[PDB]
């Protein structure tokens, strides 16, 4: 029923500074089972690396070396939080949090998991505007005709981190619908990428919303990208 | 010690096409580990699909069906009804069933195996084609098409940049297309297609 929620797509620091990966559960209870952290490094399996139980201890996978992660987990806020210090190029992975989730009853649990955040060491600071810089693309009239849909386009472009996420909604309704997506293109040290979506006949009226998620995005939020309906 | 190795790293199937992902262990017995599948898919990441004896994810039990094949500690998924959103990776992932201390409830992965959609052998078609703009940017839209290799083509005089196009599967298992580019005459611009030995253009629908 619940589910965990990992906001920083990707979380970009230069050597030797520290950083500080979230999660927050929602619909799960937290005080009860441990949250878990795993790390899977370029080329890596997915692998144990952290987890902090309710009591508060807080175990680390084998090999790990010291003074090098921290976990925690305030309950009231319902997050947890992986610190990495002194962070470094061999750092350079997705983290991907994870809890078991109790179903019914004893012997029936699952094992639920974040989307993870990957993260990016560079190294010097960037100084310049990394946003992605969208662009609306409205149907062609003539497909209006074709199987009377019509399909919408947003362009993002000269983002950084090229770590991105894009889906649609109906503005009002907002649940995620069915679109499709090219890959994620370089161009010259920043790239960009674009999804479309064909709404059918009846749709045509509604207003949608292109919603882009980037580490770099204006404020830190989400980007809302509004489709006019026609 | 204990590892998880997947049979192929890539494992392509056709839309509709039963196909089964293997996994097999090489450290212990499949019998005292509880096996996990997962996959991550564009869009959703990580999803949780089987885990040890009928438990399915919400909406996984459907499509798919997971088992085990402790002859030779093998895991397995099949997948029954492929479609595009069944284009990605899946891991296999496994872990210890109660031990006698104080044990962990970590699992253990393997590396994933990618699987990638293509629509099934079918009879070819003439696509549609069509152009949206926006200043100088001219988008070229192919529509229903089959086979899949197609050139795309935006009838420009003065073209500032041209980006790599998209083949992606259709709602009605075929092809669609898009391909963008930066244009000073864009509103001029039309799009020309050459796909199945014929010539199709923006212009042909107006």
């Known amino acids: 029923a619940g589910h965990l929620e990992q906001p920083q797509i990707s979380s970009t620091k230069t050597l030797s500074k520290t950083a500080r990966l979230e999660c927050v559960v929602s619909?799960?209870?937290?005080?009860?089972?441990?949250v878990y952290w795993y790390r899977e490094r370029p080329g890596e399996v997915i692998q144990f690396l952290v987890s902090?139980?309710?009591?508060?201890?807080?175990?680390?996978?084998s090999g790990i070396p010291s003074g090098k992660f921290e976990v925690d987990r305030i309950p009231e806020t319902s997050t947890s939080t992986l610190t990495i210090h002194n962070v470094e190029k061999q750092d350079i992975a997705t983290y991907y949090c994870?809890?078991?989730?109790?179903?019914?009853?004893?012997?029936?649990?699952?094992?639920?998991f974040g989307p993870g955040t990957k993260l990016i060491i560079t190294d010097k600071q960037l100084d310049a505007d990394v946003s992605p810089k969208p662009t609306i693309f409205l149907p062609s009239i003539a497909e209006t005709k074709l199987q009377k849909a019509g399909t919408y386009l947003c362009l993002l472009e000269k983002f950084f981190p090229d770590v991105i996420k894009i889906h649609w909604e109906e503005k009002k309704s907002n649940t995620i619908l069915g679109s499709q997506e090219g890959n994620t293109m370089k161009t010259n040290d920043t790239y960009m990428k674009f999804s479309w979506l064909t709404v059918p006949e009846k749709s045509l009226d509604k207003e949608h919303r292109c919603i882009v998620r980037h580490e770099n995005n204006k404020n830190g939020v989400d980007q809302e990208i509004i489709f006019p309906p026609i | 010690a204990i590892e998880l190795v997947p049979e192929h790293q890539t494992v392509p199937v056709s839309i509709g096409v039963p196909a089964t992902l293997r996994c097999s262990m090489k450290?212990?017995?499949?019998?005292?580990?509880?096996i996990n599948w997962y996959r991550k898919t564009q869009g959703n990441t990580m999803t949780f699909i089987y885990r040890?004896?009928?438990?399915?994810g919400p909406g996984f039990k459907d499509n798919f069906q997971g088992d085990i094949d402790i002859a030779k500690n093998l895991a397995v998924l099949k997948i029954l009804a492929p479609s595009e959103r069944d284009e990605g990776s899946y891991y296999c992932?496994?872990?210890?069933?109660?031990?006698?201390?104080?044990?962990?409830?970590?699992?253990?992965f393997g590396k994933g195996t990618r699987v990638t959609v293509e629509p099934r052998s079918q009879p070819h078609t003439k696509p549609s084609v069509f152009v949206m703009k926006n200043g100088t940017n001219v988008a070229c839209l192919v529509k229903e098409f089959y086979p899949k290799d197609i050139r795309i083509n935006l009838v420009s005089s003065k073209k500032i940049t041209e980006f790599d196009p998209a083949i992606v599967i259709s709602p009605s298992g075929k092809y669609n297309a898009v391909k963008l580019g930066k244009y000073e005459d864009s509103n001029s611009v039309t799009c020309s297609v050459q796909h199945d030995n014929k010539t199709v253009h923006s212009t042909d629908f107006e």
């Open positions: 450290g212990e017995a499949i019998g005292n580990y509880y």
């Open positions: 619909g799960i209870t937290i005080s009860a089972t441990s």
């Open positions: 992932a496994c872990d210890t069933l109660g031990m006698g201390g104080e044990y962990t409830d970590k699992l253990i």
């Open positions: 040890e004896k009928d438990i399915y």
């Open positions: 902090i139980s309710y009591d508060g201890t807080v175990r680390k996978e």
């Open positions: 994870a809890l078991w989730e109790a179903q019914q009853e004893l012997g029936k649990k699952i094992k639920v």
